[PDB]
Amino acid sequence: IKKITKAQELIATSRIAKAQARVEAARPYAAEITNMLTELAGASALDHPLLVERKQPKRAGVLVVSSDRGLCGAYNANVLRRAEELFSLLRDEGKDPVLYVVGRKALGYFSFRQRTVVESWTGFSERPTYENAREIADTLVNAFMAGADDEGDDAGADGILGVDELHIVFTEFRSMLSQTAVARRAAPMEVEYVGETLYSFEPDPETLFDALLPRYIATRVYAALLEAAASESASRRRAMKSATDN
Amino acid sequence: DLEKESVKVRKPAP
Amino acid sequence: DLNVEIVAVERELWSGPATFVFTRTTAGEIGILPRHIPLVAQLVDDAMVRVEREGEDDLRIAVDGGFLSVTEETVRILVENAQFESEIDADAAKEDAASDDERTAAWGRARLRALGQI
Amino acid sequence: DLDPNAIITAGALIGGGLIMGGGAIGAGIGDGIAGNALISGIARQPEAQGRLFTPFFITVGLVEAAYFINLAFMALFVFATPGLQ
Amino acid sequence: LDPNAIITAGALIGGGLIMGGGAIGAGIGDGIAGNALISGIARQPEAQGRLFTPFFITVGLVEAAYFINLAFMALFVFATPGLQ
Amino acid sequence: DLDPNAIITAGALIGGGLIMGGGAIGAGIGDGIAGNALISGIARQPEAQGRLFTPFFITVGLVEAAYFINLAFMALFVFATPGLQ
Amino acid sequence: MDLDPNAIITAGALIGGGLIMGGGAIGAGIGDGIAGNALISGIARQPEAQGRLFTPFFITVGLVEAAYFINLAFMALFVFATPGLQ
Amino acid sequence: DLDPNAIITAGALIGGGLIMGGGAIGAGIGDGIAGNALISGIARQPEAQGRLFTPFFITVGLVEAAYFINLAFMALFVFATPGLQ
Amino acid sequence: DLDPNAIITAGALIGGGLIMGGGAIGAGIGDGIAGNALISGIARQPEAQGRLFTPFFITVGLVEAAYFINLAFMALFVFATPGLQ
Amino acid sequence: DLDPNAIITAGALIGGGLIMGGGAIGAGIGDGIAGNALISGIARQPEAQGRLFTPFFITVGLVEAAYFINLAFMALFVFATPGLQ
Amino acid sequence: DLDPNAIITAGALIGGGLIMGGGAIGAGIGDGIAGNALISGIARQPEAQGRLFTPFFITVGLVEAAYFINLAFMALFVFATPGLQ
Amino acid sequence: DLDPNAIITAGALIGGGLIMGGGAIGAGIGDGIAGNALISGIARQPEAQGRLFTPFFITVGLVEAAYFINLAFMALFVFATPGLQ
């Protein structure tokens, strides 16, 4: 045990180093895609359904990002507590949560709670890759887009019942010592007007902007996954240190 | 309490 | 010369000087020279990027989800994925090519074009 | 006073000249425009070249067809002048 | 002098001008509609099936005017009004 | 001496020829431009076709109208020669 | 010889009116075509901006057809009230 | 006599007809081009409408002026013909 | 027995009419095209309006000049007809 | 009495000049348009020049032929005037 | 009193008139289009103001010449008419 | 009896004027279009100015070639009028 927990603690420290390296490595792409998105938004109409809130919303696609392995001390506990708080907020607002999960621990918790899970992607919380983030973002965005024509309990012409909002519940890695589970709304996004040669767009700014928002959502979900992995590694290091002290 | 994701636009508030 | 910077979501791939940057865009093929005007474009799903520089052979790359941002003194290519010419394997690209999936076919075609078979 | 044939033949030749002027203007400019579209298309989509002739030629055909049609009538005016005395 | 001579010369001039103007209009309009169709097919390869039919409207209008002139052109060179 | 009425008739008929020739060139070019715009709009988005007929038919309406006027006036230049004395 | 002055004057006036009308018709047709091209491109791109986009088209049509109607009026004056008639 | 006054008056009338032809062509085409520019600018930039009018009305004010200038000269040809006998 | 100076004046009048009518066509088209460019540039980049006038009035100059130059020679055809006998 | 040959030859020559002028306008405009297409294509993609000559020439040919054809007929009008009395 | 010199003078006047009409049209169109390009380029790249003039002043220099050449030959029709006696 | 040579020369001058008008219009419009293409290219890819000048020179050469061809025919008409007597 003592040897096992100490070895796990040191391995977790190395994993934190690697996860921080990954988080930093993805920063330039996210920054530059944000710059391009700002440029396109400035020079195009902001009418995308992804960018305008629907009326009388009654559903919300919540993503709960948890860990595959269970040795992390309270990571899953904090994530699920924040998810419950978000569910209470959504119920108060009047929307029925629609649940998407990542990692086996959250699956176990929700199955025990008997709540329904629309889709689960498991097996990569320890080290997510952009393919997983792209798949998750694509599924969530399809669910959200299908939620335009859907009315009340009626799916409308789609036949598929969508969602009127997307939230990501995940653990920010503030520092090597600080981790915190928060729920961040990723869709429908809101436009923020910051005060302060022109870029020649090909073919037109609107098509590029429409094709770029889904990739921006995927990038943000990937950043959330990287933060979740780093936070999980930090929590694992802390739990292993405490256990070795026990 | 709930972080909202927004796209920054380099324009004056309209 | 203009400094290309091929960046991908998972990491930064390539950076350095070059003379010519050929690629494909939904609008159509496009070749960027050192003093090109600012521009923003979306590469085709099976796009290929040929960065031709001085002192060494050209650099052929296959790209998934390539968005090309041309600006003064620097060029950015935000790629969901990218693969250099040497690494690509013809057999795997051909096998992935002709598959029903549009994404699989696009990536197989991109690999083939980067290789040279097209 | 003078033979009507001279004036009527001069009028016929002027009419045919107008026929050719109009046909030339229309055909040349239309062919230029169609060729501009085609040149842009191949400049942007090389592989599209083989699939661009099918509409292009059609327009060309029609764009040229009128000219050739006009040509025939010019021959009618100069050589087969209706109403010639 | 023969009034028929003057009338027929004027009729030939008028018919030549009519046909020339009609040819200019038809050529220009057809070439423009072409350019449009070629651009559409280049950008949208699969749209030709849905583009030919609307395209045929443009010419179907443009060339119509030409044919109008055609018919009326005959009335100048073959049925000169007021030739007496 | 030369039947001045003949000169008046010839001038009026050439004038009507000018009327309808100018009308024809203008109408043809305008219809071509409008059709080019319609084709481009349809190609860029198929569904929008559903409504594009409204503006397009307005444009040709102005074009065709400008043509129709000439037609009528053309008649007043040939079949009812003004100032025939 | 001894041709009626009124005959030559009226022939010249009618040919001039034909030229006036041809120029006016060309101008009107081309202006309508180009303005309609812009309007149709706007409508196709921006269905919502249809109401907003009408007004510039209305102004362009007004100017073009104002020139056209001035040409019509002058042609009518020439053909009917021919200056220099005598 | 052939009344050379009639010949010169007819020449003046033909000249003025051409003056109107040229002026109308220039005005119509230029104003159509400017209107296309204005409509496109409005479509791409709904907010920029207030900015577009001042250059637009400049462009009009130029082209129309030329047309109107030509109109003025027609009077000098068709009302006070320079060279009447 | 028509006077020779009469036909000379008629020819000069027609020539001047063609001259400045063609000048009108050129001026109208060129000014309209330059105005379209100005409108597009301002609509895309309104802040640059003050900069775009300085070259925008160059081309118009380079355009208007010809028209006016043309008009100048038209006067040389009308006020003092060359070769008038 | 007027010589029929002189009137017929003058009419033929004016017609031929009109044909050649129309052909010149058509050739110039179409060739310039095709050259603009080629220039834009090469600016967008320089290396494309090698594959743009093949279509380009066709377009130019598709115009140039017509031009030269007019020339031929124009010669027929002046050197061998149809119906030359 | 059918003095030939008057007829040659009228023909020269009208010929020079067509020469100036075509030259003015060409110069106006060329300057307007080259302008449009220059205005668009500067609007895109203001700092290119210096670099865009060099090609622009080529185009103008080559089109105004094509018009100014006409001017010279226009004089050849009026001031020193070939063949005139 | 009007001198046949007078009508021959008048027709020759009219035809030469027509040829020059057409050639000037074509050359001017082709120059404008090609120069606009060159201006846009230089604006977009200044490093390709050398490669751009070659196609620009090709197109302007094949335009001004036709214009000079028209120049040569007008010179022939005004120096060696076909059918002169």
Residue numbers in the entry:
A (entry chain G): 18 to 213, 220 to 269
B (entry chain C): 532 to 545
C (entry chain H): 3 to 120
D (entry chain M), F (entry chain O), H (entry chain Q), I (entry chain R), J (entry chain L), K (entry chain S), ...: 2 to 86
E (entry chain N): 3 to 86
G (entry chain P): 1 to 86
Paper lines:
The membrane domain of the mycobacterial ATP synthase is embedded in the IPM, with the catalytic F1-domain of the enzyme extending into the bacterial cytoplasm and attached to the membrane domain by a central stalk and a peripheral stalk (PS).
Similar to the prior study, the electron density maps for each of states S1 to S3 has density for both tethered and untethered forms, and hence those particle classes contain enzymes that are auto-inhibited and others that are not inhibited by this mechanism. In the tethered forms the mycobacterial-specific extensions of the α-subunit make contact with the γ-subunit. In the first element described before, residues 520 to 548 extend from the C-terminal region of α-subunits and provide a “hook” which catches into a “loop” provided by residues 212 to 220 in the lower globular domain of the γ-subunit, thereby tethering the stator and rotor together and inhibiting rotation. In contrast, in the synthetic direction, as the interacting surfaces are both negatively charged they will repel each other, thereby preventing an inhibited complex from forming.
